Design a protein around this nucleic acid. Structure first.
Ligand code: FES
Ligand SMILES: [Mg+2]
Ligand SMILES: [Mg+2]
Ligand SMILES: [Mg+2]
Ligand SMILES: [Mg+2]
Ligand SMILES: [Mg+2]
Ligand SMILES: [Mg+2]
Ligand SMILES: [Zn+2]
Lengths: 37, 278, 177, 50, 65, 37, 157
RNA sequence: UUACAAAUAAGCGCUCUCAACUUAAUUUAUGAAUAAAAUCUAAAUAAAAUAUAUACGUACACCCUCUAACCUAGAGAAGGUUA
């Protein structure tokens, strides 16, 4: 989890969710791609 | 005459006896602090121990759960018979109805409903048993007005190298910005003579003939001072009353007359052979 | 009219006991009503020097309701006065410890910031649930309308009421539902 | 100086007292203060707040 | 409602509320707390004042009708 | 009639009646000093 | 409405469905909301309207089945969340899978709740008069509803 | 052990020290919007999970004779004791 000002999808499998009051991109293939706002 | 009349509680319409159940709290005792002596265990280690003597401990007053605190009931227990000559009439009136001579101190014990005991019931040192951890509370020794060095362990100031009339003084009270002194700031004042509690003291041995409890370590207060002794409230010893006289120990029943001295297993009794670490 | 001097004065300045039900009510709206009666601002004879306030009894204060996310967003702050004695508690946490605290604090702020506010708070009686002491019940004169009309739940709606409302859309036959 | 300035303030404070007392009286019958005052004016009734 | 005929001067009602139970006449502290609860006031109201204020009070205040 | 206690209130109500029986009500017609005759 | 029955052999049986009240007041409306003149006249409190678009366990029905437009589908979805959070749908509670019981924690009464109470943090620095932090009430999606007040509704409390 | 070459005070001597209702990052389970054997949910939900803290316990409670004397109580006062 890197917290970034602007969140961007990084690969095809990346998907976006709204958990606990923030936007997350989570990638099953590459955990590196996980991001938080 | 009054004391003898209260010797046999079981033959004086005792309140119903209930079984022990988890979460129960028994009544405690008030004891006099005799002094200290060394005590040795079968492993050869030496333990300083304080001697607590129960003198004329009786239950005096009972308040139901509702009338004292919704959570639990209370019992008042007094010890150490005192003179009747320099006492207020209100205190003397209270004891006259109860049929007892006045006691030096009253303390309140939170006791569950099942463990309630009728007022006027004598309490004895055999209430506690060796192997039991206990909590003792008493007023600490009074040391009078004291400075910050002795009261709060302040370092002070150097003795030499030019210090001008500043050796045992407090330093800066606070910072200048707030323009005031914080409440609770540590300052010179009267030290000691406060109620303090010592937690988790083991009971090494009980003397039935003289009603002496042997408690590990130190107890607050001076010699000949009354203390309050009750089962330990520490979580580890949560339910120890399971194997102790649940309401209290009644000599009147005398199912088996107790030995003069009761010992803990680890304690090395005097008159035993010399300890050889074989 | 036609009374003697003292009975007339006694009647005019007598204090009344009112009942508020706080079930499903916002504390602020309850506070507005209670603060009005406590001061005596409901009387034409009101004067700030007359001490003409009334008794307000509020029940079901445990069952008050907040709009929005105020349960988790509204914070109550206190200081013991010692270093490190600053406490901040959310509305839900304060409600859990004391069911009656939220209503009392809302009313306290609404009363005038003077010495008479402390006296007025003595006339305020807050009970977490419907149970009231018998003596307080006998004093009661009137109950006050709830400031907020409580919306009904689905189960509360009668079968006739459901039919009255139209079926806006029809689910197709080939649906799992 | 306080007495002289209080002479002007006294008149304004009395009007505030009247409006509060009128609001209490009108609310007993279910009317807000603005509704009571303006609609009485619209009836050509010129009774003052005092 | 019918009047409750079975059981009255306001003094009698006052006396029962301010029953003398402990230590015969109570001190200022305990007495004032008893009075404050009965009349739903605070303790501060019941304490006396010094002689500056007592001598300032008018002997004959004006009376209207 | 009003009263601090029920007995006092009832006693006051007795006086309210007697006032309305002897025509001495508080809102009774004011005394007439007009007549020069 | 079709239900699946299992026996392995499993089959689905279609059942007759309750029919909509005939003759809508405003025919030619695309959305079912506008065929009854409800565009700006429903809120979270209107369980009777909201319940019709809800699955038995509280989920929203898909748009392609209800036929609502996107604008009104989002309003219904948001109103349903607020209705659920206000405890106005006691019979559409989540199904308990197995060996699960309700939390048993006492329920706080709330209404007009924009966000899930779990994920909303406390306002520790509330701010002064002009930097006051606002507590959101209601939903922005319902900003166009008919208002009977002199001034617009106070969303930020 | 160091003093008062006092009956005490000290440490360099000895003893005792504990529970967490409720919660953040984060991680699981059921599950719609979104046709899924999707999705941890600023959807309805069930949980686990820092440091905090006081819901929860200990301590305190008593109601007040006091010429005077004495006190391990103390500046004074207060407080304790009196066969
Ligand atoms: S209301 Fe008409 S398109 Fe939905
Ligand atoms: Mg030792
Ligand atoms: Mg001393
Ligand atoms: Mg030094
Ligand atoms: Mg020097
Ligand atoms: Mg300052
Ligand atoms: Mg003006
Ligand atoms: Zn990726």
């Amino acid at each position: 989890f890197k917290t970034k000002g602007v969140i961007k999808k990084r690969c095809k499998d990346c998907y976006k969710v709204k958990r606990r009051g923030r936007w997350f991109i989570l990638c099953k293939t590459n955990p590196k791609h996980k991001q938080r706002q | 005459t009054q004391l003898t009349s209260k010797l046999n509680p079981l033959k004086d319409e005792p309140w119903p006896l209930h079984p022990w159940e988890p979460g129960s709290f028994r009544v405690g005792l008030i004891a006099l602090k005799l002094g200290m002596m060394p005590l040795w265990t079968k492993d050869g280690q030496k333990h300083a121990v304080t001697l607590l003597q129960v003198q004329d401990c009786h239950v005096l007053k009972y308040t139901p759960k509702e009338d004292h605190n919704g959570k639990i009931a209370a019992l008042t227990v007094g010890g150490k018979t005192v003179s009747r000559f320099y006492k207020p009439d209100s205190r003397l009136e209270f004891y006259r109805d109860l049929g007892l001579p006045p006691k030096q101190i009253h303390k309140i014990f939170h006791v569950t409903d099942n463990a309630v005991i009728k007022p006027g019931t004598p309490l004895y040192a055999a209430h506690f048993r060796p192997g039991q951890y206990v909590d003792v509370t008493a007023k600490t020794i009074g040391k009078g007005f004291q400075g910050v060095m002795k009261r709060w362990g302040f370092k002070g100031q150097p003795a030499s190298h030019g210090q001008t009339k500043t050796h045992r003084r407090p330093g800066a009270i606070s910072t200048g910005d707030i323009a005031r002194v914080w409440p609770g700031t540590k300052m010179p004042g009267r030290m000691g003579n406060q109620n303090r509690t010592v937690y988790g003291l083991k009971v090494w041995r009980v003397n039935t003939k003289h009603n002496i409890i042997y408690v590990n370590g130190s107890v607050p207060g001076h010699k000949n001072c009354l203390v309050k002794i009750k089962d330990s409230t520490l979580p580890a010893y949560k339910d120890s009353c399971k194997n102790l006289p649940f309401p209290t120990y009644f000599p009147d029943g005398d199912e088996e007359e107790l030995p003069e001295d009761l010992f803990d297993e680890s304690v090395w009794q005097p008159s035993e052979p010399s300890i050889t670490f074989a | 009219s036609s009374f003697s001097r003292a009975p007339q004065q006694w009647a005019t300045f007598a204090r009344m006991w009112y009942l508020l039900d706080g079930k499903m009510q916002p504390p602020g709206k309850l506070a507005v009503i209670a603060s009005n009666k406590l001061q005596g601002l409901n009387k034409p004879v009101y004067h700030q020097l007359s001490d003409c306030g009334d008794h307000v009894v509020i029940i079901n204060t445990r069952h008050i309701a907040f709009s929005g996310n105020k349960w988790e967003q509204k914070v109550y702050s206190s200081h013991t006065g010692y270093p490190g004695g600053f406490r901040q508690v959310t509305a839900a946490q304060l409600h859990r410890k004391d069911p009656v605290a939220i209503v009392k604090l809302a009313i306290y702020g609404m009363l005038p910031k003077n010495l008479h506010r402390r006296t007025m708070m003595q006339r305020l009686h807050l009970f977490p649930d419907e149970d009231i002491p018998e003596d307080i019940l006998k004093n009661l004169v009137e109950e006050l309308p709830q400031p907020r009309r409580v919306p009904k739940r689905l189960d509360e709606y009668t079968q006739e009421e459901i039919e009255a409302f139209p079926r806006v859309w029809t689910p197709p036959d080939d649906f799992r539902m | 100086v306080k007495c002289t300035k209080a002479r002007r303030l006294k008149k304004r404070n009395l009007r505030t007292l009247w409006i509060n007392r009128i609001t209490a009286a009108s609310q007993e019958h279910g009317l807000k203060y603005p509704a009571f005052i303006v609609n009485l004016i619209k009836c050509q009734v010129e009774l003052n707040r005092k | 409602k019918p009047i409750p005929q079975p059981d009255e001067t306001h003094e009698q009602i006052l006396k029962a509320k301010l029953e003398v139970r402990k230590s015969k006449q109570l001190e200022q502290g305990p007495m004032i707390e008893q009075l404050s609860k009965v009349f739903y006031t605070t303790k501060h109201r019941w304490y006396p004042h010094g002689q500056y204020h007592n001598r300032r009070k008018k002997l004959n205040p004006p009376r209207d009708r | 009639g009003p009263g601090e206690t029920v007995l006092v209130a009832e006693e006051e109500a007795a006086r309210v009646a007697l006032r309305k029986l002897y025509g001495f009500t508080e809102n009774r017609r004011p005394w007439d000093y007009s007549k020069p005759k | 409405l079709r239900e699946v029955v299992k026996i392995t052999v499993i089959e689905g049986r279609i059942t007759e469905t309750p029919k909509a009240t005939p003759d809508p007041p405003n025919p030619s409306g695309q959305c079912p909301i506008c065929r009854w003149n409800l565009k700006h006249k429903y809120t979270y409190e209107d369980v009777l309207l909201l319940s019709q678009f809800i699955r038995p366990y509280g989920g929203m029905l898909p748009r392609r089945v209800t036929g609502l437009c996107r604008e009104e589908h989002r309003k219904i979805e948001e109103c349903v969340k607020m209705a659920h959070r206000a405890g106005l749908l006691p019979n559409h509670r989540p199904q308990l899978p197995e060996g699960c019981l309700p939390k048993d924690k006492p329920k706080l009464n709330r209404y007009l709740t924009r966000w899930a109470p779990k994920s909303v943090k406390p306002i520790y620095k509330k701010g002064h008069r002009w930097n006051k932090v606002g507590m959101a009430v209601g939903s922005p999606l319902l900003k166009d509803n008919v208002c009977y007040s002199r001034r617009p509704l106070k969303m930020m409390h």
